[PDB]
Amino acid sequence: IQVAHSSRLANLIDYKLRVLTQDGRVYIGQLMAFDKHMNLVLNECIEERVPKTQLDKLRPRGTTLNIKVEKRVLGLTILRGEQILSTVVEDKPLLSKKERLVRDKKEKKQAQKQTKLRKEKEKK
Amino acid sequence: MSALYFQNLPSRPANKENYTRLLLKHINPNNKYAINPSLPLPHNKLLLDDQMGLLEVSISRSSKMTNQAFLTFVTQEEADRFLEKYTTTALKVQGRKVRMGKARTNSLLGLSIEMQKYNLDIKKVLKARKLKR
RNA sequence: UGGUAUGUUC
RNA sequence: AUACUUACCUUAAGAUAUCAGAGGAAAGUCCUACUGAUCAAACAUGCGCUUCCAAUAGUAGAAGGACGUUAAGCAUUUAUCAUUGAACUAUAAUUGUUCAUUGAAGUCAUUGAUGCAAACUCCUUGGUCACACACACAUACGGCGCGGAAGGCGUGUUUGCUGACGUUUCCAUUCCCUUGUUUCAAUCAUUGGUUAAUCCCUUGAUUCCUUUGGGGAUUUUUGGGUUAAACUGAUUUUUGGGGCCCUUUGUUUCUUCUGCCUGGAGAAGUUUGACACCAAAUUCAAAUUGGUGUUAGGGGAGCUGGGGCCUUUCAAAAGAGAGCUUUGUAGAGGCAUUCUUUUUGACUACUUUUCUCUAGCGUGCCAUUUUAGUUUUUGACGGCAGAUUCGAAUGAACUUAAGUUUAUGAUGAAGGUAUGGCUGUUGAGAUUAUUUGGUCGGGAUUGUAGUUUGAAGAUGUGCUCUUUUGAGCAGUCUCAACUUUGCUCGUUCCCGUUAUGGGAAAAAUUUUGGAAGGUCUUGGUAGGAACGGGUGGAUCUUAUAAUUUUUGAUUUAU
Secondary structure, three states: OOOOOOOOOOOOOOOEEEEEEOOOEEEEEEEEEOOOOOOOEEOOOEEEEOOOOOHHHOOOOOOOOOOOOEEEEOOOEEOOOOOEEEEEEEEOOOOOHHHHHHHHHHHHHHHHHHHHHHHHHHHO | OOEEEEOOOOOOOOOHHHHHHHHHHHHOOOOHHHHOOOOOOOOOOOOOOEOOOEEEEEOOOOOOOOOOEEEEEOOHHHHHHHHHHHOOOOOEEOOEEOOEEEOOOOOHHHHHHHHHOOHHHHHHHHHHHHHHO
């Protein structure tokens, strides 16, 4: 997967991130929101960690290393920004960029209609 | 030095380096090259690509001949031994079985191996200029 | 010059 | 809904791209539908850009899962602490071992946990597209079918963060088909192109009548018109046939209503509106109030934004130009000048010694003319051997014929031909002998001689400066610009003449910019501009490096 060179964390809404924390744990999920303190909200994020028993297979010396990774499933979590260490992008969004544009124009139309209605209703 | 000819290969891998490595995985799984990605492949111009005889693959994008490819081997005998590995059971790359047979014309790198066993290049380039006519 | 909230009356 | 009663609130500031240049209200400020350069955003638009997009010629496969099974898999390892009594081993207060008693805590698990590995089953995801079932390639591989996904880079236009809301005495302002699809045929209709019947105009040929000329007929000649008997292509109505699809699962999913498998259908509607659904309480339903959604997909006509390519027209670049000489002007740079002494620094010549190709002439070194030899060139050409072939035209032989061999074989192409090559001519490179030239001393050391600089004096013109041998300006030299002059060359035209000069200009060619038109493509099609504020949200700066996120107590440490 290739990510745009000028893509800040505001562009990467709905991409699937790979957040790394201080205790060596990786959180993987769809990005929903972020903040000034850099504390995310992740939709289907699944925590992974390397157990202390599997860890010495990572130490520098078969061809490929195989690390059984203890993963827990949690859903719609908010992380805290103090713990976050770095974020990487794993997967693109579901919808295409064109199709995302179509949805956004549609939603702008529907919202403007609803507030026009709410105004003309409060007048009568 | 005899190049095998393959029909009925998949034509969607695109990049030659990716195509050769994926094919070569389906040939000999847990090969040296196929299981380490981001190794350079040998370019052997007039280093075996794979042991048990495999020396190069050669594909083209030319819209006459999409699915066909040509594997050239070390010697005349390994070309016949490779058919023996199938033992009348068809090899399959992706979901399609690959019919295969020895080529009507030997490979150019195979001619280089047999000739070493440049005037030929002069003849071939003049052939190319005649075909450009 | 306001907002939200509350409960009563009709 | 109103109203009334209370209770709780009624705010961090500031900013909107940067740098430079011109202008306006000596330092700075502010501003400019000012101007350059950089940056950022949006929107168009391109790159021979880079990666990826699943069998049906088949019962597959790729990517990611399983919080799935085999499974108590196979191999290791774990399940308290204190007090007191009793036996007990013993070097021993009784350290070890076993049984019971009091107190204290105590995640569940032991079919667990941990290590290793394999088979199987199943979920989600995708162009399961079009043309192909193909002999490729060294410069390694036509990346030269249409789309889609994701990035990289470039150009153009607009903007200077971005959005709603109000005002305008602003501009705006469209239609049509279609909802299984595709294909073949029968048939209907429309339209164009040619031929044929009545022919006409125009005109090539013929023929006949007549006055040079004109007219009739045929070719219905050349194109157009009347007309539509024949053929051909594009659109459409009705019926039938073939293929594929229907999981479209609420049987097309734009909505409602009618409706369907021997079928794919009918009616009405399409945004200040309609439709579907959710929640309540009145004591079923309806009623209302409050909410969440839906209003689609494809094709066409106009209208319009963008690119590529072509035509025309206009302007500037390239050549009445270029160079050289003469005169004047003015700008810019550099410094005057001469000799003598001293011999600071530098160079040159000679003496002694040392070393070096040979200390010297030659040899040797260097330049290179192709005169000669040699060597080389995917150099080029021509021919030959494999059959030199091919425009297979023609003859003959083998042969039914076909095919093959050969000849007309240069009348024209194909480098020659070969997936070993030979032979001849010529161009380039290299070397030597030459056509010929130049060279035979250098480095270290040493004193003397000469020039020039560091210093002194006499000078050399005047001013500014100054202790001076003196630095700048009038003085002198070098270079460009303007003006005049003849000579030499030159893109195009003319003349004197085609020696060459004179005159004119791109009017012939190209590149750059703009206007118009053609062609191809790609996108849009109901909002848009201007003004405005006790308007929302982004970004930025400062409070803010002082316990609640970003100015360090998670490299396990001594």
